[PDB]
Amino acid sequence: SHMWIGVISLFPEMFKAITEFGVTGRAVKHNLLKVECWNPRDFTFDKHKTVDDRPYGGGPGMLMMVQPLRDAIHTAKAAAGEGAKVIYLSPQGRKLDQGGVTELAQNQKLILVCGRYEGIDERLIQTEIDEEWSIGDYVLTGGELPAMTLIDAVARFIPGVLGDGLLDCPHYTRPEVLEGLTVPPVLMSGHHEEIRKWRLKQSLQRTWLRRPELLEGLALTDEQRKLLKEAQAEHNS
Amino acid sequence: SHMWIGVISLFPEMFKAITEFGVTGRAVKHNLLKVECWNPRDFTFDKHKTVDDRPYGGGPGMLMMVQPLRDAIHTAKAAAGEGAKVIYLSPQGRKLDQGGVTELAQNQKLILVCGRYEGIDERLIQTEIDEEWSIGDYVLTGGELPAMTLIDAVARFIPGVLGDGLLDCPHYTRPEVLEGLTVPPVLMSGHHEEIRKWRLKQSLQRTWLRRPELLEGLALTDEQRKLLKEAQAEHNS
Ligand SMILES: CC(C)(C)CNc1ncc(C(N)=O)c(N)n1
Ligand SMILES: CC(C)(C)CNc1ncc(C(N)=O)c(N)n1
């Protein structure tokens, strides 16, 4: 099953970062992921191709001009056909987490609207946007990096693109000793079950130490409860 | 005051997305922000320029090979001189928010290590990395988009790049009526103080409705307490 993502952006060439490189680049080349861009600048009619406009009420910044942006959105919606969810990315949106990625990955078509300047007219959010999403509680110069982050995250769910609430365990590769630090012997034991339990215990320990609030949201298995208790006992010596 | 950011990445051309476009592109052209990239592939010695390696303990994925990555990091550190903080980006790191952006923006030099595959050897985190940071609780195919997100966020603090804990207020531009929706008359009143209070009240209302936990962390001013009370009264009709 493939995924189609329409993007509205003043800087469509930024999207080469995901369409030309790495796992996502392969997904695009293999037609597993399609990314199509529309630029509001192409929908302007004045000589200077104006894409910003002044905010009612004054203020230091500018907003995206409504007409070119609205026309670009409508063109993207026509290209998508029916069933495409239109998303605006901003810090005022629902904060993205891996559960939200999983939800968004259920869509076969998405349209991502990338804001620049101080943002977009509130009435376009009311009339054109289905959902507002944020990649995190911080402020950027534009919505393109958030859009690409979202695309990369959801692309991992497309069948063929790739070859539990806890933080990842530590990983080791060659050499066996690096600046005096050795690989945990269990990882060289060849005992698959002991290795699985070590990695799970490490993930539980790391989540407890670094992000204890994430543990509150989990219903730990019996095995996970035991390994977490073991890790906490070792921490308390 | 300018900022220098060294980047370690297998896909340095992805960084054109921030260095060639928009506000960050201007910052680079004007020498306010410098982004310098080193690619571990350039530090390999085998015929096929191998940059991945197998994890001790088995598993489905690969890790970044230690030697090319270590050598790239050391070269970046030599180029940076003293005082450069080395950051690894992963979901196991401290979660980025605007307060964390402000902290990171105090550095004149940063080195950002971008992981690919299943990540990097834990001992390199111990021996080479000063701080681990996450852009959010979700999983991506590589650390490049997180690195670019971080760069964009901190670049906004560099003097000359640009022309309070609450969500932003709604913004409006032309036309006065859009699909039957009118601009709030206060924004056309020309009354600067009434406009300021309306925007602040809207920010308080939106934060309360969408992200009430963010309000708990704020020490509201008298004015903010009053406007929030007004907005909550209007919500309860
Ligand atoms: C100002 C404008 C909203 C137009 C773009 N800046 C921006 N900053 C942050 C995010 C985010 N955290 O998701 C985003 N989507 N966009
Ligand atoms: C797997 C590997 C860690 C190498 C890169 N994937 C990744 N996914 C997410 C983030 C983040 N949330 O910050 C990140 N920095 N990197």
Short mmCIF file of N, CA, C and O and ligand atoms in Angstrom, two decimals, chain A residues 152 168, chain B residues 64 88-92 114-120 133-144 146-147, ligand 2:
data_model
loop_
_atom_site.label_atom_id
_atom_site.label_comp_id
_atom_site.label_asym_id
_atom_site.label_seq_id
_atom_site.Cartn_x
_atom_site.Cartn_y
_atom_site.Cartn_z
N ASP A 152 8.57 11.73 7.01
CA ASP A 152 9.55 10.69 7.33
C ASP A 152 8.97 9.72 8.36
O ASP A 152 9.05 8.50 8.20
N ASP A 168 14.85 3.27 23.65
CA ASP A 168 15.66 2.23 23.04
C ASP A 168 16.78 1.80 23.99
O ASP A 168 17.21 2.56 24.86
N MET B 64 25.75 2.53 12.78
CA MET B 64 26.82 3.23 12.11
C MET B 64 28.15 2.61 12.52
O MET B 64 28.38 2.27 13.68
N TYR B 88 24.35 14.66 20.24
CA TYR B 88 23.77 13.56 19.48
C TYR B 88 22.26 13.65 19.57
O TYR B 88 21.70 13.81 20.66
N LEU B 89 21.58 13.52 18.44
CA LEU B 89 20.13 13.63 18.40
C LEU B 89 19.52 12.24 18.34
O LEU B 89 19.86 11.45 17.45
N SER B 90 18.64 11.94 19.29
CA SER B 90 17.93 10.66 19.27
C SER B 90 16.71 10.77 20.17
O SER B 90 16.63 11.68 21.00
N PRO B 91 15.76 9.84 20.05
CA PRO B 91 14.60 9.85 20.95
C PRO B 91 14.95 9.61 22.41
O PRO B 91 14.10 9.86 23.28
N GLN B 92 16.16 9.12 22.71
CA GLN B 92 16.60 8.93 24.09
C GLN B 92 17.12 10.20 24.73
O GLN B 92 17.51 10.18 25.91
N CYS B 114 24.46 13.21 13.44
CA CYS B 114 23.20 12.71 12.88
C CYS B 114 23.32 11.21 12.69
O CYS B 114 24.08 10.74 11.84
N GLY B 115 22.53 10.46 13.45
CA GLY B 115 22.55 9.01 13.32
C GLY B 115 21.71 8.53 12.15
O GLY B 115 20.73 9.16 11.74
N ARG B 116 22.12 7.39 11.59
CA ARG B 116 21.36 6.63 10.61
C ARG B 116 21.32 5.17 11.06
O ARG B 116 21.91 4.79 12.08
N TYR B 117 20.58 4.35 10.31
CA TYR B 117 20.38 2.92 10.64
C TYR B 117 19.73 2.85 12.02
O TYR B 117 18.81 3.64 12.31
N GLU B 118 20.15 1.92 12.88
CA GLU B 118 19.58 1.81 14.21
C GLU B 118 20.26 2.70 15.24
O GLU B 118 19.83 2.72 16.39
N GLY B 119 21.29 3.45 14.84
CA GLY B 119 21.90 4.42 15.72
C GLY B 119 23.40 4.22 15.78
O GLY B 119 24.03 3.70 14.84
N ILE B 120 23.98 4.66 16.89
CA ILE B 120 25.43 4.66 17.05
C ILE B 120 25.83 3.87 18.29
O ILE B 120 25.03 3.61 19.20
N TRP B 133 19.87 15.04 22.78
CA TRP B 133 18.62 15.79 22.66
C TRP B 133 17.69 15.10 21.68
O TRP B 133 18.13 14.49 20.71
N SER B 134 16.39 15.21 21.95
CA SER B 134 15.34 14.70 21.08
C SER B 134 14.47 15.86 20.63
O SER B 134 14.19 16.77 21.41
N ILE B 135 14.01 15.82 19.37
CA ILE B 135 13.05 16.83 18.93
C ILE B 135 11.61 16.44 19.25
O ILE B 135 10.70 17.25 19.02
N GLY B 136 11.38 15.25 19.77
CA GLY B 136 10.03 14.84 20.10
C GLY B 136 9.93 13.34 20.20
O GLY B 136 10.83 12.60 19.79
N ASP B 137 8.80 12.89 20.77
CA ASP B 137 8.59 11.48 21.07
C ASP B 137 8.05 10.71 19.86
O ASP B 137 6.96 10.16 19.86
N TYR B 138 8.88 10.64 18.83
CA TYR B 138 8.54 9.92 17.61
C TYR B 138 9.84 9.48 16.94
O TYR B 138 10.92 9.97 17.27
N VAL B 139 9.72 8.54 16.01
CA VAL B 139 10.86 7.85 15.43
C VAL B 139 10.98 8.21 13.96
O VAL B 139 9.99 8.12 13.21
N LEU B 140 12.18 8.60 13.54
CA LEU B 140 12.46 8.98 12.16
C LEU B 140 13.53 8.07 11.58
O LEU B 140 14.16 7.27 12.29
N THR B 141 13.77 8.21 10.27
CA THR B 141 14.77 7.40 9.59
C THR B 141 16.20 7.88 9.82
O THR B 141 17.14 7.14 9.50
N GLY B 142 16.39 9.09 10.34
CA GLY B 142 17.73 9.61 10.56
C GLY B 142 17.67 10.86 11.39
O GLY B 142 16.61 11.49 11.56
N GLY B 143 18.84 11.25 11.90
CA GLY B 143 18.90 12.45 12.71
C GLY B 143 19.04 13.76 11.97
O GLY B 143 19.10 14.80 12.62
N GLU B 144 19.06 13.75 10.63
CA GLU B 144 19.25 14.98 9.87
C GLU B 144 18.08 15.96 10.03
O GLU B 144 18.29 17.16 10.22
N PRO B 146 15.97 16.16 12.57
CA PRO B 146 16.14 16.76 13.91
C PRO B 146 17.25 17.80 13.97
O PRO B 146 17.07 18.84 14.61
N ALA B 147 18.41 17.52 13.37
CA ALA B 147 19.49 18.50 13.37
C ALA B 147 19.07 19.79 12.69
O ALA B 147 19.35 20.88 13.20
C1 LIG C 2 17.33 5.93 14.68
C2 LIG C 2 18.13 7.20 14.82
C3 LIG C 2 18.14 7.65 16.26
C4 LIG C 2 19.55 6.95 14.38
C5 LIG C 2 17.57 8.31 13.95
N1 LIG C 2 16.13 8.43 14.09
C6 LIG C 2 15.69 9.49 14.92
N2 LIG C 2 14.38 9.49 15.22
C7 LIG C 2 13.93 10.46 16.01
C8 LIG C 2 14.75 11.45 16.50
C9 LIG C 2 14.20 12.48 17.39
N3 LIG C 2 12.91 12.24 17.78
O1 LIG C 2 14.89 13.40 17.83
C10 LIG C 2 16.08 11.40 16.14
N4 LIG C 2 16.95 12.38 16.60
N5 LIG C 2 16.55 10.43 15.34
#
